[PDB]
Design a protein around this ligand. Structure first.
Ligand SMILES: C[C@](O)(COc1ccc(C#N)cc1)C(=O)Nc1ccc(C#N)c(I)c1
Length: 247
């Protein structure tokens, strides 16, 4: 289980937001914690991505671009699984110190996005996603969004993405002698992966608008995040960078 040992080995641990839960909920505070949390998780997404099998093959510039484009989606996917395993989808488990109930979802002004993630959370349970399918799907998620004008080394990217899809096939086939059974499972999983993109898009859109009016809502955007929202996020929203759907 070489490939799976590695994913299990590099999976990031618990990341906290540093939120003040003794303080009454407020839009400004909730968003500042989401921003800080986002930034803390990105530190780990980079380290995780760099230790992924084959990731170093990519051109240095494609490595940073791919990580930044996939950032939101990766957090969404990982948060849904935590929400499912920790609180059986009753609340969104952004972090141990940042759990959203409907009241928080509503005050964050990202209710529709939150409800969609809760649904994703429920999907992990309904589809009985195993920890291993989760780890592979998550890694594959990192290789699911590219520029129309291509990466510096598109070919190396295509090879890598193909190899990860082949790993998922193996995880699905393992203990499934029935081809039909493997096909239906692959269908279910690629469908779940595709559902992540639309959610990341709404969060992207929301975050973009929020930054532009940041000075009007007292929200504190971290340096790195502000730069990525203004430089990378617009390419996605304008259609220059697109996610790779299966369906
Ligand atoms: C509102 C915002 O702070 C915006 O953060 C980002 C993150 C990535 C990009 C990009 N590219 C833009 C904003 C946010 O959605 N944060 C956030 C933090 C943690 C999780 C988890 N788990 C999630 I889903 C979202």
């Amino acid at each position: 289980p070489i490939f799976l040992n590695v994913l299990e080995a590099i999976e990031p641990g618990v990341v906290c937001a540093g939120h003040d839960n003794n303080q009454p909920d407020s839009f400004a505070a909730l968003l500042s914690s989401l921003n800080e949390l986002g930034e803390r998780q990105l530190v780990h997404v980079v380290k995780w991505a760099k230790a992924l099998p084959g990731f170093r093959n990519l051109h240095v510039d494609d490595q940073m671009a791919v990580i930044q484009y996939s950032w939101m989606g990766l957090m969404v996917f990982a948060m849904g699984w935590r929400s499912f395993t920790n609180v059986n989808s009753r609340m969104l488990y952004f972090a141990p110190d940042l759990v959203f109930n409907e009241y928080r979802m509503h005050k964050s002004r990202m209710y529709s996005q939150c409800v969609r993630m809760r649904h994703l959370s429920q999907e992990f349970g309904w589809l009985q996603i195993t920890p291993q399918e989760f780890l592979c799907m998550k890694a594959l998620l990192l290789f699911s969004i590219i520029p129309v004008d291509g990466l510096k080394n598109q070919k190396f990217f295509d090879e890598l993405r193909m190899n990860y899809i082949k790993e998922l096939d193996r995880i699905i086939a393992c203990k499934r002698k029935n081809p039909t059974s493997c096909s239906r499972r692959f269908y279910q999983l690629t469908k779940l992966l595709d559902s992540v993109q639309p959610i990341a898009r709404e969060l992207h859109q929301f975050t973009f608008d929020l930054l532009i009016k940041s000075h009007m809502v007292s929200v504190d955007f971290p340096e790195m995040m502000a730069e990525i929202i203004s430089v990378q996020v617009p390419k996605i929203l304008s259609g220059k960078v697109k996610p790779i759907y299966f369906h």
